Write a structure and sequence with these properties.
- 2 copies of one chain form a homodimer.
- By secondary structure, chain A is α+β, with helices and mostly antiparallel strands.
- The first copy, chain A, has one domain: START domain (Alpha-D-Glucose-1,6-Bisphosphate, Chain A, domain 4), CATH 3.30.530.
- Helices cover about 25% and strands about 40% of the residues of chain A.
- The first copy, chain A, contains 3 helices and 7 strands; from the N terminus they run βααββββββα.
- Chain A has a 7-stranded antiparallel beta sheet with strand order 1-7-6-5-4-3-2.
- In chain A, β5 and β6 form a beta hairpin.
- The termini of chain A are far apart.
- Chains A, B: In the C-terminal section; belongs to the class I-like SAM-binding methyltransferase superfamily. Cation-independent O-methyltransferase family.
- Chains A, B: This is Tetracenomycin biosynthesis bifunctional cyclase/O-methyl transferase TcmN.
- Chains A, B: It comes from Streptomyces glaucescens.
- Chains A, B: The tetracenomycin polyketide synthase (TCM PKS) is composed of a ketosynthase complex (TcmKL), an acyl carrier protein (TcmM), a cyclase (TcmN) and a probable second cyclase (TcmJ). TcmN is a homodimer in solution.
Amino acid sequence: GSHMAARTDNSIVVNAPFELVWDVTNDIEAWPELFSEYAEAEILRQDGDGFDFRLKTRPDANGRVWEWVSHRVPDKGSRTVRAHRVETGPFAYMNLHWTYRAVAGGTEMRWVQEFDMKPGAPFDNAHMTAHLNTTTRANMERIKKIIEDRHREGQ
Amino acid sequence: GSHMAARTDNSIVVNAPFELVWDVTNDIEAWPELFSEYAEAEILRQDGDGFDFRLKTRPDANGRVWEWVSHRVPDKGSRTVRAHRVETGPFAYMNLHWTYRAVAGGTEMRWVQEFDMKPGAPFDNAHMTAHLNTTTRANMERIKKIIEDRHREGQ
């Protein structure tokens, strides 16, 4: 039979210039602090064009933990980032696309995820879509707050 | 006439492994967030063995702001970092030495600063010593808290 793939599309404006928002959000070493969702973020190797890194989440409200490896390709020149899952997990596939658009007073981050769950996975498209929206919004809001706070150079 | 140079010696134990404490404290991009004292931390160039970077403080209680360039040389293999001021400012000289010692449950950071103020500088050895101790302790405590918090992988 046929079915539709899943997708998430979230945005948030960070009151800081592109350079800072880009540098912070792409500083993998800081991810476990920047993202409340990530317990670990380990770069495994630099595939030249991009890199492969392992991510592991902090347990969610139910105690579930996710861990996977993804190939990430940042492209500062194009103010864009793309990545996709490479392991055999519940996701048939999962790819990401981040854009950083200049707006009055800051940078608007837009994160898009396109995926499809394997049949029988603990989470189906509907459930995972809800889970990802919740965590993504939480992550983007924490990141906004952290960046804007460090961006203040006064007292 | 003769006089004695100044020195500060501060320590704090961070409940995290060397790798994490080292990586975080040497991630210059994160300094404006890690250190409440730094408004900016910009790497200017990589002098091969080390690098030169510009630092600018957030105003202190009196509204005073410091900005300087220093040559920093991290040496992970030796678990040590050394740096020194290169500009013509109120400091006749200022050099730093950080050590990371393994202790039960964590890493003890020890930061030592050796310096001497130029005569006529707004701050003399005594005043600057007090200022540096206050800010250093504040910085080390914030860093301890941040690292230990991100180090927790549970809920």
